[PDB]
């Protein structure tokens, strides 16, 4: 909340997984990857469009 | 004659190899290695004949 005001940075609060190891829990990630060896920026491109 | 391998480069994403050799007419009879110059104590272009 009273971070939510700052106009200048971007600060985010919450608490760390249950258990300490890259814990996502309910939460997917993943990768996107050129194998092509297509451009970098048609990577971020490719991200933008995600 | 034996090639060199010189420095890094890059090929749309990967990095390579850059080589540096002789064209192949000018390595393929023993009178070719005559062919090759070498700068001397001063400026000077001396065959491999000498």
Do not use: C
Not at chain 2, 3 to 8: A, E, F, G, I, K
Not at chain 2, 34 to 44: A, I, L, P, Q
């Amino acid at each position: 909340m009273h971070f939510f005001s700052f106009k200048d940075a971007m600060v985010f609060a919450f608490a760390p997984p249950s258990v300490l190891e890259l814990g996502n829990a309910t939460g997917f990630d993943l990768f996107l990857q050129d194998q092509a060896g297509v451009g970098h920026e048609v990577l971020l491109q490719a991200r933008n469009k995600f | 004659w034996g090639s060199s391998y010189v420095n890094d480069f890059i090929d749309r994403g990967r990095v390579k190899r850059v080589y540096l050799q002789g064209r192949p007419d000018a390595r393929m009879n023993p009178d070719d290695l005559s062919k090759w110059y070498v700068r001397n104590d001063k400026g000077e272009m001396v065959p491999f004949n000498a």
